[model samples]
Target: DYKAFDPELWNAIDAEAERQQNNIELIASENVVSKAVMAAQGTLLTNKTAEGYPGKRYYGGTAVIDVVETLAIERAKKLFGAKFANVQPHSGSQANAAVYMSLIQPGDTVMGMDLSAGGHLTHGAPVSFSGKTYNFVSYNVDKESELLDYDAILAQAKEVRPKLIVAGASAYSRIIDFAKFREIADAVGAYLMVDMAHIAGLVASGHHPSPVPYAHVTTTTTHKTLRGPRGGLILTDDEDIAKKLNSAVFPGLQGGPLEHVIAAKAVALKEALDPAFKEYGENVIKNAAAMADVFNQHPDFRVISGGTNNHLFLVDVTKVVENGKVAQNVLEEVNITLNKNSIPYEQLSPFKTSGIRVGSPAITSRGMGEAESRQIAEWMVEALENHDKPEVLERIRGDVKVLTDAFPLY
Candidate 1:
């Protein structure tokens, strides 16, 4: 077994597992996969490699691999209620890349949310390939409300007349109105694309509105809120666009599809289709709201957008902690893990931000409820306020260990 044969790597993996078991993960983009998804990814499929689609592979001896990928594609289509799904791209950025390749030409004008306003790098941040390739204009949140300014977006859309309007965000906590985005795109005669990478689980369970019917192309990671293996998926209702997406993923971008991850995605998608998954999605939002409420009740902490309707929320931590990085480091000392993130109209550099992004996906996966979520938020508040006190930090660390031991992640 590799566990004995390669002790170095296995030891590191064990350490990671122990760390995960001990720490409180609050990162919005992370989740814990189900055992079924985990097992499927470690199956015999890992040794298999196939290029192109299920029935039309460019390689030989892929009949079984074809079945697994086909299963993943079918389940993905079913989960998202889309006519066609491509489960090939290795990551969300690749998925978004392939969609852009299929739909728009290089240097085409596009519009997306500003990075500081909760948008993702793949959604047209300057450092990402999407921004480098396309001429991207950005929309922002309303300064006072810190929410999507649809009316403002429309004005920008009308002025720029972008070829594509990208919707969805990575850190936004509200229910995104896909219909409104559709209306904006329609007015400008632009194709709408939605990268629902962070909210894919919520959308699948009807916790958030689906973008499948509104967008010409929809892309997401199989990981994140989906709690699946690490991979990407693309969906489109239009037959021609779907065909183009398949080609883009296969011939234009990657050569071989990861059958193992596809199998894991299939298992996760099947689980998501179950009736109980809706409850999981609901619990995720409720837990996040519980945490947000706790932070908001404290005058020193500010919950972005007032509160959250989704699984994640941003808390501006300038008052209690020195900055977001300080909050993150101090909380980590107490085994609470989250990320420093840019809030709307951010002034700090990329390395350090003014807010921390926290989510309930991982905690909800472990069956944590409102009480536990609220307690964790309160811990964050306490740890942040008592950063200079080593005794307080140690006590919180001990409390975290006790709580995490009860959950027992595997």
Candidate 2:
């Protein structure tokens, strides 16, 4: 053990492990990976410097790395049912960036969702590299239903004449209709790119619809609902775009591939291909719906659009607390951790959002069920209701410890 050699780092790692064990994690974009996936990232493959695609490498001594990367690519293509896949980009941002590189030019007109409507920073928010380089016209969910409005999306696409249309899947929780998006993109003669990072696992497991058939290129991260080590992946059925995606990820953005992380992606993809993973996917949706019901049943908490079709949902915590940030802090006081998020029509600043996004993927990975999910939601409401009571928060913390003990994260 490196206990004596790296005491400082090991101490922090030990504390983090304990914290993860003790807390109830509800982070919408986080999950616990399998040991196989975790170990793959810590292998000897990290020593190799593979600079290109599987067969076409710029470095010598890449034979084994070539095999590993191809396995990851094949597995990714199989899992998402795509004809081509590139498992190289280091993060989701890099994955999306590569797609942007392949599909559009700098200062080109593009269409993407605004952050207030549940879009990401990479989708062109002015301060980001994406924003500064491209003229990104924004889209939004419907004002009444808090869901995608294809009518408005099509109308704007026709007006702006964008070269590419980016679909974020969605933030306020509704199953995506990629075929409809494809129709819209075609009518406007634009390339369609779907960012399915949050729902990758659900799509692989067939709980959600696949965007592979409709999109010109699809980008996703292996970490979220996919439960893999953190890495970005791109898939496409078009060979023309596939060729562009490869070099865009290589010389255009990065120099080397993280072979160890690629191996981990292969492991996670194989795990997802298993039958039990389908069962897990089913439970993910069940638990999310169960938790959503608890929030909806309460008079104060109202889920966006009244419910969710995926693994996460957004609710206005201001109904019970001052804002989403306050609700996040109060929930963490009782050892329950989820993030504050913007509502459909956010009235406040980004820092002090009106709502919080709740999710069940991490808890489902811990082997908890619908019952446990409901119990956790109730605990959140109870703690938020009595935010001023220190004694009550302490009691909830103790109860959460008991639940966490019963469902070990590892």
Report the lDDT tens digits of candidate 1 across residue range 328-385. 9899999989999989988777677889999999999988999999989989998899
lDDT of 2 at 252: 88
lDDT of 2 at 225: 92
- The worst-scoring run of ten residues by lDDT in candidate 1 lies at 345-354
Q: Across residues 1-410, which tens digit of lDDT does each residue of candidate 2 receive?
A: 66999998999999999999998988899999998987889899988899988779997899888898989999998899999999999999999999999999999998998888877889888988999999999898998988899999999999999999999744658888999999999998999999999999999889999999999999999999999999899999999999999999998899898999999999999999999999988999999999999989999889998998889998787867888899899999998999888887899778989988888899999999999999999999889889889999999999999999888977
Residue 26 displacement in candidate 1 (angstroms): 0.6
Which ten-residue region of model 2 has the weakest summed lDDT?
Answer: 168-177
Q: Each prediction's Cα lDDT score?
A: 0.90, 0.90
